A paper describes a structure:
To provide insights into the structures, key residues of association, and multimeric state between the SARS-CoV-2 RTC’s cofactors, we solved high-resolution crystal structures of Nsp7 bound to Nsp8. Crystals of Nsp7/8A were shown to have a truncated N-terminus (at residue Glu78) for Nsp8. In all of our crystal forms, the heterodimer formed between Nsp7 and 8 places Nsp7 near the half β-barrel-like domain of Nsp8 with the N-terminal helix of Nsp8 extended and pointing away (approximate dimensions of 40 × 40 × 46 Å). The similarity between all heterodimers in all our crystal forms is remarkable, with a root mean square deviation of 0.82 Å for 184 aligned Cα atoms despite different unit cell dimensions, different space groups, and different asymmetric units. In contrast to previously reported Nsp7/8 structures from other coronaviruses, in all three of our structures, either as in the asymmetric content or symmetry related, a heterotetramer or a dimer of heterodimers is present as an elongated, thick rod shape of 40 × 92 Å. The differing crystal forms show only slight variation in the packing of Nsp7/8 heterodimers to form heterotetramers. In Nsp7/8A, the tetramers are formed by the crystallographic twofold rotational symmetry. The heterotetramer interface involves a total of six helices: α1 and α2 of Nsp7 and their symmetry mates (twofold rotation) α1′ and α2′ and α1 of Nsp8 and the symmetry mate α1′. The tetramer interface is not as extensive as that of the dimer having 1813 Å2 with 73% being hydrophobic.
Author numbering:
A (entry chain A), B (entry chain A): 0 to 79
C (entry chain B), D (entry chain B): 77 to 191
Write the structure that this text describes.
Amino acid sequence: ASKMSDVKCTSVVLLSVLQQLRVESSSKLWAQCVQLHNDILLAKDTTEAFEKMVSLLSVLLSMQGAVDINKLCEEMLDNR
Amino acid sequence: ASKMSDVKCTSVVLLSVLQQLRVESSSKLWAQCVQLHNDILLAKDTTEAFEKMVSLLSVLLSMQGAVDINKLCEEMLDNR
Amino acid sequence: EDKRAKVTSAMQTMLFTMLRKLDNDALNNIINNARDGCVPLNIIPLTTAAKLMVVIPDYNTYKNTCDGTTFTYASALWEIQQVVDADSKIVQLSEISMDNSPNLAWPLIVTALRA
Amino acid sequence: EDKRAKVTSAMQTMLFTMLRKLDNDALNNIINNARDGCVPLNIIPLTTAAKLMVVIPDYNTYKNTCDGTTFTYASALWEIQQVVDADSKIVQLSEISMDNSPNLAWPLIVTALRA
């Protein structure tokens, strides 16, 4: 009904990106990513959805060897 | 770089919707949904991405007890 | 299952909202047909002459999709091979008329191949 | 792993393309900081006075985010509690000056709390 649907679709992808990085091996951390994924889908206003999205995205950014953001911008700037 | 990113994000959600419907119990069908999910993400033009999306969405629509589309439109028309 | 079902209803509502935002002719066709009870029985194939099996609930949906031996579905043309009723009895293409419509055992099943 | 990595690179490219389409001030901040090497060490908390640990690579990024005892990050203000270097030696807030910048063991680590 608004942009709210774009944040919830991205949160499913972000959880899928984490599970492909084999984060499920940590039951402590995976349960936190799952609960944040459930919080974003059940959020009402956009403020609660984005703030929970920051916590979920920070999980990805806290893993140094997982993703180099400069690498994906190179594959993006070469094609544009 | 185009709408191509919206179809690939939806295909991840559709595969996640299937896995929550416990489709993974069928190794024959789950491997077909996984391979279509991989085909959409690796597609180049939008024509190949949408046609593979039709095959993946038809998996959901072929399950009668999984989703009643009329139910979700009621929860959507009541809120709008 | 109460906490789990609320997430399922939220993800499925988001799924079709994204599909509705795409506005794809082939995607809108199979979703709108599924709303009327016209649902497929197997994965919609993309290769030529591959088997597709769709269910047709009433006669008003039949004439909207079937013209002669051609079957329009998912923004594609399909050559009809078999037509059966609810008792697995094969029905010819000549029986399906407006005068003989309330005599068949609806719904029917069409086994067609891609063009 | 060759077939699997191509899907991972495709899904991650789609992930940030969606994030770039959102254009959220708090999301753009943590992504742009991560590009410069300013990455968090734990999950960014939402409750007040909760612990957050961020890495600051160089001095030019420090003055862009730190002002006095306040730390701006993820579109929120954070009260700095500890500052350590690469040798886990606590560094006072008065040492971090433009004259003493090339004498510290960069990068540093800030342990702050939400407001």
